[PDB]
Design an enzyme around this catalytic site. Structure first.
Site, PDB file in Angstrom:
ATOM      1  N   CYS A  34      68.899  33.096 -16.999  1.00  8.25           N
ATOM      2  CA  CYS A  34      68.423  34.467 -16.869  1.00  8.25           C
ATOM      3  C   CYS A  34      67.033  34.599 -17.487  1.00  8.25           C
ATOM      4  O   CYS A  34      66.858  34.376 -18.689  1.00  8.25           O
ATOM      5  CB  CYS A  34      69.415  35.432 -17.527  1.00  8.25           C
ATOM      6  SG  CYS A  34      68.898  37.173 -17.562  1.00  8.25           S
ATOM      7  N   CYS A  37      66.660  37.234 -20.401  1.00 15.83           N
ATOM      8  CA  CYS A  37      67.299  36.675 -21.595  1.00 15.83           C
ATOM      9  C   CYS A  37      66.369  35.716 -22.319  1.00 15.83           C
ATOM     10  O   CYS A  37      66.288  35.732 -23.555  1.00 15.83           O
ATOM     11  CB  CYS A  37      68.589  35.951 -21.226  1.00 15.83           C
ATOM     12  SG  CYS A  37      69.896  37.002 -20.542  1.00 15.83           S
TER      13      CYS A  37
END
Length: 113
Positions: A34, A37
């Protein structure tokens, strides 16, 4: 001789880190694939340095902890949970990237409660 702050932990580790906490606790639920993230992890390292001793930052790989991620109903990544030092002062749960400044303001406002 030589000398040597955002710790990756497990679900069981998080249980105690929550019950044994001395400071505000920030828990970052994340996945390795991600983008946001990845960026949030950099902001969190800045937060954990600039506020050393005021917060502990831990991160939890949702892929490695699928049980816990279902138990909490993690739907969007990253997911950030900020648990104040003392009970009564209520926690915060949010989704998405947050710049380190915003994270620090949040912890600051929780400190004056």
């Amino acid at each position: 001789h030589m000398v040597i702050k955002v710790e990756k932990i497990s679900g069981e580790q998080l249980e105690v880190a929550i019950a044994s906490r001395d400071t505000t606790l920030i828990v970052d639920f994340f996945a390795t694939w991600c983008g946001p993230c990845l960026l949030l992890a950099r902001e969190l390292e800045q937060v954990a340095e600039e506020m050393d001793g005021r917060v502990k930052v831990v991160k939890i790989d949702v892929d490695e902890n699928p049980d816990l991620s279902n138990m909490l109903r993690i739907q969007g990544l990253p997911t950030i949970v900020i648990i104040p030092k003392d009970a009564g002062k209520p926690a915060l749960r949010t989704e998405g990237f947050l710049p380190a400044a915003q994270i620090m303001e949040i912890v600051g406002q929780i400190e004056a409660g």
